[PDB]
């Protein structure tokens, strides 16, 4: 293949563990479609609200659907969660 992780952020890993905990699908990668291994119902509602409270982002159910992949999902959060970047030091 091209690379191993290539450009994989640990944030993407959170998106995957979110999906794994909800759907049970483990053999998903960051470039694969988390868009419903089987049940594509409320399962996305749970993970969107999950990332929301984890990184301090505002991810909606349909926002999940607009990204398509966990990587591109994480990209939304990546940029948005930077607003609270380094919250312990408070960027002082």
Ordered domains of the chain (ranges, CATH): 10-81 (1.10.1200.10)
- Write out the H or E segment, with its range, that includes residue 55: helix 43-55
Contacts of 29 (CB under 8 A, 6+ apart): 16, 70
Spell out the alpha helix ranges (H) of the chain: 10-23, 43-55, 61-67, 70-80
Contacts of 79 (CB under 8 A, 6+ apart): none
State how far the alpha carbon of 50 is from the alpha carbons of 2, 31, 33, 59, in Å. Answer: 31, 20, 18, 9
């Amino acid at each position: 293949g091209p690379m191993a992780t290539a450009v994989q952020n640990p944030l993407e890993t959170v998106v995957l563990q979110a999906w794994k905990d909800i759907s049970g699908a483990d053999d998903f990668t960051t470039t694969d479609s988390f868009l419903g291994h089987g049940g594509n119902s409320l399962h996305f509602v749970q993970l969107a609200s999950r990332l929301q409270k984890i990184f301090g982002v505002e991810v909606s159910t349909e926002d999940v659907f607009r990204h398509g992949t966990v990587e591109q999902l994480a990209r939304f959060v990546e940029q948005s969660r930077d607003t609270g970047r380094n919250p312990a030091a408070q960027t002082q």
